[PDB]
Symmetry: D2
Subunit: 289 residues, 4 copies
């Protein structure tokens, strides 16, 4: 299991400087892995990232959220094709980095829909995601669909829905990515989604109810980690936090990061790293007693 940190803790612009900076700060915070948010994978400087990752002995993953122009759940085949094109490039980036995990909101646009998903749209989404997963499979890359709340997608809001989505595709490298922040809204509790989704659970985001400091919100982390321990989850556990102190020109607007949740990402990162690691340490003793 790799303990990771989302890139938006450190910077909103993933240029050469942002890449080295995020990688460095991640390592200094005590994390094993950095998750790069690849909103624009075409321009992502792979060589700099490879250099920085090697320098700090850090692993990497990639996440992304689609938009209207790249909505794979669209009824417009051209829009779907564009989204598929973007997803494929992200996967290519991961392959060049020698990474293994791609995740995020890749089954739809990451936004507040003003209509329910349509039958035709859902068919297009599943087909597009199937083709990306197949391609990723040949490159030795896993693809995990991140379940997000009603305001960020109209397709997959719960673990159960994600399981039904994956049932049709039946792709071996296709998994489910759960996020405590999103689970806090949609799920019935923190243990049930883990247990139902146990086979497919491939990626985990650790986020507080307001996406700030861990333990300063309403998320039931204790039940979540205990359930993770029960199913013997051994995949990535990545801290994710957003504040107006670190702004991504598009991503911050899309996630509605209006408020200040923290000013000092160094204290935040180190704290989050310890929070996650110590929780896992304690949870490991539970089976013994």
């Amino acid at each position: 299991m790799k303990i990771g940190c989302h890139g938006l803790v450190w910077t909103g612009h993933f240029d050469a400087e942002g890449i080295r900076y995020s990688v460095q700060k991640t390592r200094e915070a005590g994390f094993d892995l950095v998750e790069f948010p690849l909103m624009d994978p075409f321009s992502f400087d792979v060589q700099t990232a490879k250099s920085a990752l090697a320098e700090h002995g850090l692993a990497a993953s990639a996440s992304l959220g689609l938009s209207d122009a790249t909505d794979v759940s669209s009824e417009d085949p051209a829009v779907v094709k564009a989204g598929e094109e973007l997803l494929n490039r992200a996967v290519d980036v991961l392959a060049e980095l020698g990474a293994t995990d791609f995740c995020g909101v890749i089954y739809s646009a990451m936004k507040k829909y003003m209509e329910p998903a349509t039958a035709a749209g859902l068919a297009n989404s599943k087909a597009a995601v199937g083709r990306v997963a197949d391609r990723a499979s040949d490159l030795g890359i896993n693809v995990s669909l991140e379940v997000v709340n009603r305001y960020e997608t109209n397709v997959l809001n719960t673990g159960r829905q994600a399981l039904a989505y994956l049932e049709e595709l039946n792709r071996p490298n296709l998994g489910i990515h759960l996020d405590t922040y999103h689970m806090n809204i949609e799920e019935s509790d923190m243990f049930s989604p883990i247990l139902d989704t146990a086979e497919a659970l491939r990626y985990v985001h650790i986020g507080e109810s307001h996406r700030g400091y861990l333990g300063t919100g309403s998320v039931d982390f204790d039940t979540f980690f205990k359930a993770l321990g029960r199913i013997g989850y051994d995949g990535p556990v990545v801290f994710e936090s957003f504040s107006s102190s670190v702004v991504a020109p598009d991503l911050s607007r899309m996630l509605g990061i209006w408020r200040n949740l923290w000013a000092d990402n160094e204290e935040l990162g180190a704290h989050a790293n310890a929070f996650i690691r110590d929780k896992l340490t304690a949870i490991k003793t539970i089976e013994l007693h």
Copy 2:
């Protein structure tokens, strides 16, 4: 204290038949009060409402959410003026009904903004709301701003933000409206917001994390009700839950109701009424032991 139920539980269209139906269902479910959604107050059948309320001996309140055309936080004075007009009419409706509580998202549009709030926008919102409060005050009507999550507003996301907003306006009849559903995301916990806004807390919405049956989600209702009891809150406590089958396509899309958490609103309403009253009965015993 009045135990209430949002009208949207029962019907999506508040015409003559809808008004009578929602009022009757509310009374049959055991509630003291019904909250009418006045999205369009100009076409609200006030007379039918007065009749139905008297028939069932039920109290009433009103809430609405603004839209793009009536966004009082806009930098466009034409838009701001439109919103203020909508607000003023709603207040007139309540005055006619002899009701005393107006609430909801009246300081901004109820939607997912793609940009942070602006200084000019905030100024316009505050000015308009102040004028509306003054108008309402003369009609003996209290106005409560409902704190909502980041996806429904970029203005008032926390109880403290609402306090700062109210401090500037310094209006006697201006209150704070808290909703457990929204609190469950943005707030640090369920007792701090109650304690901090005790002086200004005038309206309460009771909703599960996913707006389904009470007690089937992640809302810490226990801490919330304990906090309410500690500050001796005596205002309205109103249940809120939504179904795409029941509400209009407009509002269902606005609230992002992609899933239906219940099929029988009679059972839901009766369950919610007992949940609230029974919780209140229990919390009253705490001071005795």
Copy 3:
């Protein structure tokens, strides 16, 4: 599933008067079943119980805790035999009532031990309970061991320890009884013990952390009922509450009931009956949405 009330809500003396009083009050509070504490089954008035149960249409179960004189976990064979004799009579009483469930602290004395259990004592406990269970089996009676906290036994303090104890005996009518009050102290959380004990779980006590009003202490009922729902538990669910306003001469002392947690047991009882039934109703809805 039968919803029940422990008799110490109503009376501490099960003479004929207490028997009829407890039965009647249980029916009036809305329950299906009364749980008689048979601290002395030799003198329990079976005849009055049968008569009251019939008059009020109520099912019945019974529980008890052993004492030093009846400690089947003693190394002294005469003490063990006196215990076994008491247990056997309790099973016989239940048989005469037409009941199906015996439970409680029947594997040791119900007290604060000052020494750990002993290998010889444990073997005595199991053998006696095995014989009691076999006897009960012939009579169509299920026997469930109540897991209780460290101050009330030194043998079975967690669900896991009860499973290991049963594994040895391999009896098909021998089950596990979990109590939220006891779980709240000893267990890692409120779902694991249910999931681990699924096969063997046959009786449930619903008690708040301080054994008063439900929802006025720190017990996580939500996690507990969600887990009960997940495994399809259909055994008895019995409210259990103790206050200085209702005193049993021995039992109130043994359980350390020093404080007033309630004066009005009719309010308490109706509240608890609603709490449990409403919780089960809500959990059933998680299924389909």
Copy 4:
């Protein structure tokens, strides 16, 4: 604020070697303070303790529970006197160590009583404690009464009982010591007792529901630390944990430590030190957001 560790994490025998071992391990785990259990203060090697404390740079406090022979709530004045004598020696040991804090179950025996307290016994307890406090005051020592559960005292089971007991004595150095383990049983929630005891709260124990690893049981630490932050508590915050792995001949039997909750106290101790510190760090951030 001093973050501390109870000595029973390390050893059950406070001979010279035990004293040195406990102080060393406490320092190595990252704590500021060691809490000595002074069950027999007449035989406690003060000089070795001064030496070990100095060597490792550690502050110190002491606690004890009384027994039958020393029960200051007894109606027998010789028993009261013997208790008061043991208390006075414990204060002296602290004075010689240059410490400021005495605490624990010093207002009754620390045991499972078999009947409720008596008016006369209470009056003896209060007088004795008052005298011990006055003596302590002259030496610059604060005395804090540990509120414990029903199975360890019949006198002070809730914060509010302790408040009422202090009110009578009105002593300026006499405070309330709350323990999350005990609160988890007897209190209504984890914030009310903190808010109610605010001015009088002088000492804190941090204990999981089953007294093992922090975050592996049912204690609501988040509400507790958020309430602590709210009243700006600055007294000692001390980790307390018990396992059959490390046994005190007397104390482990009195506390009912039947089960192994950990084998490796070095891991346990560093986990707890981090747990408490990291929680305080996070709670500090809440007022900023």
